[PDB]
A paper describes a structure:
[name] is a molecular chaperone found in many bacteria, whose expression is upregulated during stress conditions, such as elevated temperatures or high concentration of oxygen radicals. Further validation of the FtGroEL homology model was obtained by determining the X-ray crystal structures of [name] and Ab64 Fabs at 2.5 and 2.6 Å resolution, respectively.
The final [name] structure contains H chain residues 1–212 (with the exception of residues 128–133, which could not be modeled due to poor electron density), L chain residues 1–211, 186 water molecules, 2 sulfate ions, 6 chloride ions and one tris molecule. Analysis of the antigen-binding site of [name] shows an open-ended groove, 26–30 Å long and 10–20 Å wide, with walls formed by the HCDR1, HCDR2 and LCDR1 loops (H1, H2 and L1), and several pockets in the floor of the groove. The sulfate ion makes a hydrogen bond to Y96 in the H chain (H-Y96). The chloride ion makes a salt bridge with the side chain of H-R52. The tris molecule is located in a pocket formed by H-I31, H-F32, H-W33, H-L52a, H-G95, and H-Y96, and makes hydrogen bonds with the backbone atoms of H-I31 and H-W33. There are two positively-charged amino acids in the [name] DXMS-epitope, R362 and K364, and the tris molecule may mimic side-chain interactions of these FtGroEL residues. However, whereas all 12 Ab64 contact residues are outer-surface-exposed in both the non-GroES-bound heptamer and the GroES-bound heptamer, only 4 of 9 [name] contact residues are outer-surface-exposed in the GroES-bound heptamer, making it unlikely that [name] can bind to the GroES-bound heptamer.
Numbering used by the authors:
A (entry chain H): 1 to 52, 52A, 52B, 52C, 53 to 82, 82A, 82B, 82C, ...
B (entry chain L): 1 to 30, 30A, 30B, 30C, 30D, 30E, 31 to 211
The structure:
Amino acid sequence: EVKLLESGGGLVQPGGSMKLSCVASGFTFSIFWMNWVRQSPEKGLEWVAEVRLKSNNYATHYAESVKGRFTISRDDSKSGVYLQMNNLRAEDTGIYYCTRGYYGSNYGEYWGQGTTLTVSSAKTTAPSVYPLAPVSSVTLGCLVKGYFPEPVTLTWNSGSLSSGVHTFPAVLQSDLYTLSSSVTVTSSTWPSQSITCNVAHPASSTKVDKKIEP
Amino acid sequence: DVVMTQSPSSLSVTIGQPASISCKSSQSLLDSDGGTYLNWLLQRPGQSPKRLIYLVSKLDSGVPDRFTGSGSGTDFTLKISRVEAEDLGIYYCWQGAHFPYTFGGGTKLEIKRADAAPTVSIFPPSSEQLTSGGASVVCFLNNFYPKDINVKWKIDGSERQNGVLNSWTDQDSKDSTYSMSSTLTLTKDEYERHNSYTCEATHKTSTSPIVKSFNR
Ligand SMILES: [Cl-]
Ligand SMILES: [Cl-]
Ligand SMILES: [Cl-]
Ligand SMILES: [Cl-]
Ligand SMILES: [Cl-]
């Protein structure tokens, strides 16, 4: 199976540096060009860099806005392609995908799940979690307030409760994100059973569970 | 950088209906080797973009025959013979005839379904929040259509517009409905000095707005 394991994202202050890694497996690495592709709500999808084979001494091609700042490289031994990023600005914020081969032809469709990069001056803040109890069926809620940066992972009952769940996308307000989630179960299960909102924020090393009580 | 222009920006289609997406490039995508390097890709929110078509009309494995690419030079078209609910997401065109490789702006495909009323629910601040000095009242609006909807807040009669954070989920792939969260944020000093709070949803699914309220 073709796998492109990306890592090395996270929060970095403007003007700072960061190196992204892409460890590839499931195919012969040295015979494929490797690419970095990024995505942001402002600029959409953008090709960042391309690196070619060994015989051409690993020729590199970059997008204009990253020339002189970004450097793509590959280590055929470790089966890895890397993206060294210097002098980062806010516009570099987004999701970075590692892709295999020429995208315009066959065999070149594979992209990795990507890793997120956040370039900001705002500091890391822990989320405030508030279990939401109600005032036919019963609707429960959970409030993840005031955290930075993205992302957080909200699950219900350690991932057991998966149906009837609406996790709402994060909203940025004053350099702080706010996320909420709703759960709808049959009234015969709650408060008969126990329903707990599980929120994890790895940036602030946060793993907090909040039980819902009437 | 070759500019890829997509039209329209948003596409709303009923199940079974045919639909098409246009893509025009600033320069010809016909390369010297006789090949025309244009891709069609689809992205479902939160997930990695998946390629559907390469070389104008060649389909990747797994991609249904309902998707058909065509065109030449600078003009290209993606055609969906009969739209299914799982076809939703953002479609992008992409050129590989010139570096830097460039993407189109994208075309969001919305599944057109029957009108559905929002299942509204209001929530007073928690015990942890009030004792911490803050106060947020949360109003949930689950499983509704169309997406166009607005929530008005009311505190002891009058309304407050500041301190409101709204968030829409992406269109569900199964029931084609939308969900929306509205959080009114203020202080405990502002909260304890009032009793009744109300989130008022104004949808076209009803003449009178759907109302949930509490008194504390
Ligand atoms: Cl595979
Ligand atoms: Cl992967
Ligand atoms: Cl191989
Ligand atoms: Cl270089
Ligand atoms: Cl290299």
